[PDB]
Every structure is written in C-alpha cells, then in structure tokens.
Amino acid sequence: SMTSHSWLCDGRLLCLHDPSNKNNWKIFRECWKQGQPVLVSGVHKKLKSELWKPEAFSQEFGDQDVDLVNCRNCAIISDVKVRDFWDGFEIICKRLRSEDGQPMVLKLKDWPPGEDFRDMMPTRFEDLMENLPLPEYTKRDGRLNLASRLPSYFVRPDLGPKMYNAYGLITAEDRRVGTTNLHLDVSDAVNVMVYVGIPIGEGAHDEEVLKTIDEGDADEVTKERIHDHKEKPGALWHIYAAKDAEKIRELLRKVGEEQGQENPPDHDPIHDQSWYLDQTLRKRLYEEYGVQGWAIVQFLGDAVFIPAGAPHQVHNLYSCIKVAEDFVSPEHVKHCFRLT
Numbered sequence: 517s518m519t520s521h522s523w524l525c526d527g528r529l530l531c532l533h534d535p536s537n538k539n540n541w542k543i544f545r546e547c548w549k550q551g552q553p554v555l556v557s558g559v560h561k562k563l564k565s566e567l568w569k570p571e572a573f574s575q576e577f578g579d580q581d582v583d584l585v586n587c588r589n590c591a592i593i594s595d596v597k598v599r600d601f602w603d604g605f606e607i608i609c610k611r612l613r614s615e616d617g618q619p620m621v622l623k624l625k626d627w628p629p630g631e632d633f634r635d636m637m638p639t640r641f642e643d644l645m646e647n648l649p650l651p652e653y654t655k656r657d658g659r660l661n662l663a664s665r666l667p668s669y670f671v672r673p674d675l676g677p678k679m680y681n682a683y684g685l686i687t688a689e690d691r692r693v694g695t696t697n698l699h700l701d702v703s704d705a706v707n708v709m710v711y712v713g714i715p716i717g718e719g720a721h722d723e724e725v726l727k728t729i730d731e732g733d734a735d736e737v738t739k740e741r742i743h744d745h746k747e748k749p750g751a752l753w754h755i756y757a758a759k760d761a762e763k764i765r766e767l768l769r770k771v772g773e774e775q776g777q778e779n780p781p782d783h784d785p786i787h788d789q790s791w792y793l794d795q796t797l798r799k800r801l802y803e804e805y806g807v808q809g810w811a812i813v814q815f816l817g818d819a820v821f822i823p824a825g826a827p828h829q830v831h832n833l834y835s836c837i838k839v840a841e842d843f844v845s846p847e848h849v850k851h852c853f854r855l856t
C-alpha cells in the first residue's frame with residue numbers, strides 16, 4: 517500500500533514517500549528541529565528524464581574547457597574539454613587512463629562554474645526548482661527560507677543550484693576514498709540524485725557494490741532496498757550531527773599526529789576537507805569519542821536534506837549526476853551568524 521513515510525537508520529532517519537504531498541511539513545519539521553537529516557524518495561518521477569542524461573550534456577556543452585580530479589590520488593587534470601569527462605561516464609573503454617593504464621575514476625570540478633547554472637541551463641533550472649520537495653523551505657523565495665531576508669551579520673549562500681558530477685568508485689582499495697571529503701556548510705542544503713549511470717562494459721563490478729554498503733554500516737531496511745534490486749543506488753553518505761563537529765575535529769587531530777602530520781593544536785581538519793572516514797576511522801569515532809552518524813544510501817530520485825553545521829562525506833557507488841540547492845531554515849539560522 518502507498519504510505520506517507522517510513523523510517524531508515526533503525527528509526528533515526530525520516531523517509532518521506534511523496535515529494536509533492538502538501539502535508540509533508542507536518543512530519544518533517546519535528547525531525548528537522550532535532551538536527552536530523554531527512555530523505556525524500558521519488559523526485560525522478562516529477563522531472564523531464566531527457567534533460568538529465570550524460571549524452572545531452574556532452575552534445576550541448578562538450579566544447580567547454582574544465583578541470584577534473586583523479587579521485588584515487590587527488591591529481592588535477594587541467595584545461596580539458598568537458599566531453600572528455602561525459603563520453604566516459606558509462607562507457608569504461610572511453611575513460612582517460614592513468615600511467616598504470618587503468619581507466620581513472622574522475623570528478624568534474626566546479627561545472628557549471630560559480631553561480632552560472634541558471635544562465636547556462638534555464639530549462640534544467642526550471643525543471644529542478646519547480647519539483648524540489650518541502651518548497652516553503654527550499655524555493656529561493658519560500659516563506660521558511662530566510663536566505664533573501666537576512667542582514668550582513670549572517671553568511672548568505674551563493675545563488676544555486678550547483679551540479680555535482682563524478683564516476684563511481686570501483687575497487688576494494690577505492691572503498692577507503694571519498695568522492696567529496698568530510699566537510700560542513702553553514703547553510704542547509706537539499707541534494708537530489710537526478711541520474712545514475714551503471715556500466716555493463718567493464719560491468720561485473722556490481723558484486724563489490726554489495727560489500728561496500730555492508731562495510732559502510734547501512735541498516736537492514738536500506739539493504740532490503742539494495743537486496744530487492746529494483747532501484748539504482750547512486751552514492752553512500754555519512755552525516756554527523758552539528759553538535760558532534762568538535763569531537764570529530766579532536767579525532768582527526770589525533771590521527772593527523774599519529775600519521776606524522778605537523779599541525780598546530782587549533783587547526784581545523786573539517787574545514788581543510790582533506791579526510792574521508794573509512795570503516796576503521798568510523799569505528800574509532802564511535803568507540804573512542806561516543807559519536808554515531810547516519811549511513812545513507814542515496815538512490816535515483818532521492819533528495820538528501822543536510823542540516824547546517826552537520827559534517828558530511830559522499831562516496832559514489834556508480835556514476836552520479838546530483839543537483840543541490842542551499843537554503844536558510846529558521847531552525848538552523850544560528851549556524852551562519854557572524855558573532856559569539
């Protein structure tokens with residue numbers, strides 16, 4: 517039967533089922549006031565599927581100059597054409613190769629650049645903004661979005677949205693690497709999975725995806741979602757409560773010291789965006805510091821709501837196209853205030 521919602525993370529994560537239900541705010545706002553992330557499924561069913569394909573981005577924008585990142589070693593690939601990224605998104609035999617002759621796992625950096633999404637892609641902008649869940653919070657002019665209403669005593673978000681495009685991590689060694697490293701944002705955000713590309717070329721790697729979700733601490737119901745094998749999994753997230761950010765900084769200063777980094781005692785390992793918490797580090801955080809997070813698998817059409825101040829990291833399972841919008845809810849406005 518159709519239902520309004522369900523729970524993941526053993527009851528700690530709200531999952532809303534109808535992105536355009538006018539009564540979602542009634543269920544959402546209690547979880548949101550407590551500092552929790554929220555998942556909303558089904559957004560892909562509201563979008564024009566032809567606007568979100570890798571082959572359309574390559575056809576329309578392929579002659580633009582861009583920089584890529586090698587996710588395995590953080591090497592920058594400077595001033596290449598964006599078609600060199602898009603044409604290898606699903607077809608492994610077309611990917612740029614490292615010196616060892618393996619196809620690289622690449623992230624497309626800052627594309628579209630800065631605040632240029634709306635100017636470059638007006639039809640995409642309209643399709644996304646008109647279908648975002650919790651629109652009183654997430655729309656630029658929503659009643660519960662304070663972004664346009666705050667004085668300079670508050671850090672205001674840039675004009676969005678922002679696109680996040682990267683290949684999937686493939687090997688056992690790749691399990692310890694991030695697509696986006698651990699960091700925090702002073703605004704709230706909603707991140708929507710608009711496309712998942714699963715290769716079939718070098719496509720017997722669906723076996724090491726099963727294990728990665730396991731090692732990632734995903735709950736039994738999310739696995740039922742994986743094990744049932746009807747929905748396409750895009751990315752594994754770990755999110756931590758804003759109240760636990762300093763304890764995570766204490767762990768990362770201790771590990772940086774153990775590994776021979778020479779850091780001042782006050783430096784900020786979260787702001788540095790240099791760490792990915794692998795299974796070893798997540799266990800150490802729980803056991804040594806008492807900190808539990810939320811392990812979230814973002815499937816095609818899932819919208820992840822990330823609270824202001826919450827440390828978070830992202831690991832792509834398959835090739836992903838994500839689109840994110842920042843907002844400032846009244847519940848979390850303290851996180852962008854410039855005093856005390």
Ligand SMILES: NNC(=O)[C@@H]1CC[C@H](c2ccc(Cl)cc2)O1
Nearest residue numbers: 714722725726742745746747748
């Ligand atoms: N529709 N095309 C595909 O390839 C299907 C769809 C989603 C499914 C999958 C599910 C779980 C895991 Cl672990 C890996 C792959 O793959």
Ligand SMILES: [Cl-]
Nearest residue numbers: 551758825848
């Ligand atoms: Cl908070």
Ligand SMILES: [Cl-]
Nearest residue numbers: 637638639640
């Ligand atoms: Cl467009």
Ligand SMILES: [Cl-]
Nearest residue numbers: 541650651652
């Ligand atoms: Cl709303």
Ligand SMILES: [Cl-]
Nearest residue numbers: 695696697789
């Ligand atoms: Cl990063």
Ligand SMILES: [Mn+2]
Nearest residue numbers: 699700701828
């Ligand atoms: Mn972020």
